[model samples]
Each structure stands twice: as structure tokens, then as C-alpha cells.
Target: MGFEVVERPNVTYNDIGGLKKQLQELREAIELPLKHPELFEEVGIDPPKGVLLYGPPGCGKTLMAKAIAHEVNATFIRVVGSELVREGARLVHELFELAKEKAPTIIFIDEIDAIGAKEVNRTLMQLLAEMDGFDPRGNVKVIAATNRPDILDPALLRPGRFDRLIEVPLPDEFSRAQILQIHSRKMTTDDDINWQELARSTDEFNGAQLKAVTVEAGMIALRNGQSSVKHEDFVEGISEVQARKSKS
Candidate 1:
């Protein structure tokens, strides 16, 4: 069993920009449960069991999980779906057992579709059963990430299995600006920056692309021997980022 125990990740809600609604939902469903289990105990219901963060690649699903792990008071372990060994049938059960005994456990499986999309339906079934049989009133929460929701089997999303499917949608301009701000915080940026306009018309950009744009802007500045990233730098940044889509 190759269980990679996580050292609580170093990210916060602020570190993740422009996802107000998503963050709110996560705090209530994931954070509050681990933070104040007594509240749920009094409410006479178990907290959410499995939450699926689904959307396009680079949309911040992974980053959101990092923040969740950082904020919650639980034992967090990351299981990379593609890396799970073929002996995963036993390991899957064992992982849940470890979580069950750990109590207050949060297990995060990154790129869950790597298991679901591949021919390894065996691992998915074990995971399905694990989520189904794991005591709800018990203190274990499972959160998984994936960009390929369409390829996932229906059983994986059944009522009790990953019941809460949160779509990490593409960033709106407002969110794009927010993401831009976060990535630019450490960079020396010029007063000529019109982030509102930059984020606008940058259609279909995800968090990762926005971050790339910010860093690329800095690179442009360095090339020009400039003190700060300027407005045109981001124009070049976006061009460079979009061009990356078809790279070898």
C-alpha cells in the first residue's frame, strides 16, 4: 500500500482567488465538518462523505483541494489515481480502514479519472464500495479531482458515491482579474496595468493559464530590462499562453 500521507498543504482561501461560491460551499461541506464535528453531532447527521471537484484541466480543482487540506483539522493523504499499483484492490480498502481508524480523516485522490477512465474498473469498484460502506456518521471525508467527468462511469456518481459534484467552471472576467491579482502580488507591476481590460476578452482562460500569463508578464519585463510588468507585457503573456495549447 503506497499511501502518501500529506503534510497539510500550504494554501489558503485567499491563495485561491475568485472562487467565492466554490470556497463557500467547500468551507461548509468540507471544512466545517472537520473543524467542528460537534456541530454535526448535534445536528444528528453525518457530514458529506465524498465530494467531486470536476472541470477542465487547470481550473483550480487541485488548488482548491490544497486549500481544503490546509484549512481542515484532519489527517490528509493524497492518492494519485494513476500511480496506484495494481494491488490497489486491497490498498483501497486498507486506505479507507486507515482513514476510519484515523478518525477525522480527509483522503484526496488527484486525477480520479485516471482510475475511472482506464480499464481498471476494479479500482473504481473498490472505491465505490469504500465510499458507500464507509460510515457517514463516522469522521472520514473523501474528496477527488478530475477533468474528465464525461468519461467517468455512472456508478461513481451515484447518490451516495461522490454525491456532491461541484463543477470548477472556467473563470469569468471578474474571477480572472482576481486570479491575476494573486499571481501578480509578488511581482513588480507597473501603474499602466489595466487588469480589468486584460482579463476581459481573454476568453475561456483557466486559473493555471491566468497564472501563466502573470509569470510570463514578468518574463517579458525581464527581457526588456524594465523595473515592472506593464500592460503590453500581459498582452504578450496571453498570446504566449494561448500559443502553448498546440506545443510539441
Candidate 2:
């Protein structure tokens, strides 16, 4: 019942662009198990019990998290926890306990890498132990988010608990268009703006970056005392994002 950022949102699958690859994979793990539990048992494979949402910290994407909230809305009661530092192993165990008592649930921890490459075996051991004790019959899912290629303890990478190591892919070209539009839906815009072209020019940008682009562009428009965010404002805003990327 804690940090239920989205107890359930009404956003449907069509609310965004196509992301069926990993999204579909999540459906099989989270939804299909409840709908048809035998598909995994019959094949002699465990359903993906959890996912490691790992990407570069600078990339900073949230569309996947938003999608997960919507897709699993009907089936799960979700909770979020930032998770343990060098200590508090007992809290890790208790969080999992809470999820178990809630029946079908998801526990999201956003800083899995904070164990800091230095040994935090006390908590890490508790984490692995609790996850290892997961009963196949239980309908709990864990969404562990962290920057991959960073300081993750090898303990969390073994095998079964987090069966899916989904590297957050950059939003595809068309997807960026929608992300740009989604972030700027309220702001007044130019006359028939070519969002698709803006999307293409923003190659390698994540949803977070795209969202920032919209804000900066609108900010530029404000400085010029214009109600509509023009093409020039967006161009300068994108360049602002690019400059930071080069340095960061």
C-alpha cells in the first residue's frame, strides 16, 4: 500500500506508440500467467518472475514504467520502494513479505544499483534469499529499476528472480513524435508542426529527453512573449539538450 504511484491508471495500450517487444514480453510474464497459468508449466519453464529495468542513468526514460503501470493495472496492486543502502536487510525481507500477503502484487525498487559495487552482502544475501524462496504458485512480480553497466552487485544478476534484463531501448522515431506531442499537449504549438521531423532529428533521445525538449522549447517561447512554441524555439531547445549530453 506504499508508494502506489499508479494503483491503476486508465491509459490503454494505444495511449502511446508501438513498444510491443518488451511490453509483450512483460504481458506474458505478468498477465498470461494469471489468464493461462499452464502455458509455462506445460513447457517446463518458469514464468519470468521479475524484470531488471536497466539503462544508462543519463538516458533516463519513463515510458516503459508508464506502460507497465497501465498494462498490469487490472491484475496487480503495485508498491514502490527506493530500497536498502549498506544496511536494512530486514526491510528488504519485509517488503517481499508485504507483497506476498497482498496476493497478486508488484514491488518496484528503483535504485537496485545503490549497493554500490562495494560489498553489501548482508542486504544482498537477504534480497537473494527472499527472492529465491518465491513460490512458483505465487503471483508476485518485482520491477527492479537501475542503470545498467553501472555498479550492480553480481548477486542480483544470477538467473531466476529477475529473468528479464530489459535494457531500456531508445524510443523509435515515430515513438519520439508521440512522446514529444504527449509532453506538449497543453502548450500552444506552431501551425501544423512536423513532429515526425523533430522526432528524426532527436535521434538517440529517450522519452525523458524528448519531454525535456518540449519544456525548454516552451520556456524559450515564454521568453520571447509568444503564445505559440515556434520551430526556432524547438531548434534551440534541442541544441540545449545536445550540449548537456556532450558534457554529461
Candidate 3:
């Protein structure tokens, strides 16, 4: 009941640098349906009821959800999966009821694997029931994100439930460049900072880690009493990040 209900989010599609394909898929599945329900009705096809975004940690799944909230004029409710599990089935039903009452609502469940684990049968069942029970006319949409899709109960992934499972994978070299540019937009950088080379060097880095590299580079610059981020600073920052990750 105390879950955050966001009316408007500052994050828009523009804030998210890469994952263009994921963005497009989400728009088609969630945004378009909410904005133009008549299209689905005309086509005589049921629009997607729910969408699942699963990927490694810090790959911008949650960020994409916020962007969706911004793209649609709807009530946005954010809930944590563990909290839902702790609250039980009744609360799950209540949450969906609230979403229906609000109409044109987007309910975002982060870390859904917390309640979706195979052993959490009651909570998972309640989730499924709520998804099935919703009236298509209510204009309520569910978007769930998880880092561990393999651990989720099979029931949640069935066709009628989360009809679309979008994979938010780690950024490729081009995407890495885009992410780096977006994160570094506000920062002052030296002319020698080659984003392409930096992106190419940081193989397998997720969006969050890439942002961390930029932040660390700024920190390195400040540590040296420099006003702008430098190429050497980024190099050192990358090393520091990789070293910290390796130890973890």
C-alpha cells in the first residue's frame, strides 16, 4: 500500500542511451496499447497484458521502466518483489485493484525474481491470478524486471501472463559509446578522451558500470586538481573499476 506511485518521471526515452531495440519493443508492447487501445480492438487481438525485462544486474531494466512511465500519461506504481511476497496474495490483488481504479496505470515490479522464485508458490499464484483477472478495458499494464529469469517460476512466463520477455543485454561497442556520451554530457572532458576506444576497451561492461567509469574518471580529475576529465584519468578509472570488480 505504501509503494511509490509516480505521477511523472524525469527519465524519458532520451535519457536511456542504448538498447534501442528494447526501447522499441517496450513501446510497442506497453506504450502503444495504453495510448491507442482502439488499434488492438480493431485488429481483434488482445494487447499484451504484461511485459518482463530480464537481464544481468545494472543493465538499465529499471531505467527503461521509468522511461516507459514518462512516455505514457498514466499512474505509475513501483513495488519491490520482496515486499509483495512479504505482503502476500491479498496485497497483490489489492495492488492490481488500485491500478484498475486509476485506469491507464503502469505497475512496475523491480527484482521480480524475489517473488517469482519457484518455491514462492503462493505469491507467484497470486501474481498470475491478478494478471489473468485484470479487465483488458481497465488499461492497466504490468512491467516486471528481474536479473534471474532462469530462477523464475515457469508459470509466470506462460503466454497469457508476461507475453513479452525483452532481454536487456550488456551494451555492444556502439551502445557503449552512446551510453558513455549520455553519461558524460554534463561533464567537462579533455579533447583527448576517445569514447570509442574507451567503449571498445571495456568489454562486457553494463550501463551502470560504464557510468561508474565516467564518474570515477571525474573523481580522478578532481583528485589531481584538474577541472576536466582526461584520457589518462579514464584509463586509471577503468583499471580501478575492473580491479574492484575482480575482487568482488
Q: Name the regions of candidate 2 deviating beyond 4 angstroms.
A: 1-6, 9-18, 42-44, 58-62, 74-83, 116-120, 149-154, 222-227, 243-248
Q: Cα lDDT of model 2 overall? A: 0.68
Q: CA shift at 6, candidate 3, in angstroms?
A: 2.2
Q: Which stretches of candidate 1 lie over 4 Å from their true place?
A: 1-4, 97-104, 117-120
Give each model's whole-structure lDDT.
0.82, 0.68, 0.84
On a 0 to 100 scale, what is the lDDT of residue 188 in model 3? 94
lDDT (10s digit) by residue, model 3, range 1-248: 45788777788888887888889999998888778888888888787788999989888988888888778877788888877755477777778888878767889988888888874477778888888888563478899999888888888888778878999999999998888878888999988878899998899998988899989999989989998989888888888889889998
Return the candidate ranking by TM-score, descending.
3, 1, 2
**Ordered list by lDDT, greatest first:** 3, 1, 2
lDDT of 1 by residue, 1-248 (tens): 38677655677888887878987887788888776778898988777788898888788887887788777756777798888745788788888888777656779898888787734367788998888887665678888998887888777777767778788899898999999999999988888789999888478988998999999999989999999888999999999999997593
lDDT of 3 at 39: 85
Q: Which candidate ranks first by lDDT, i.e. highest?
A: 3
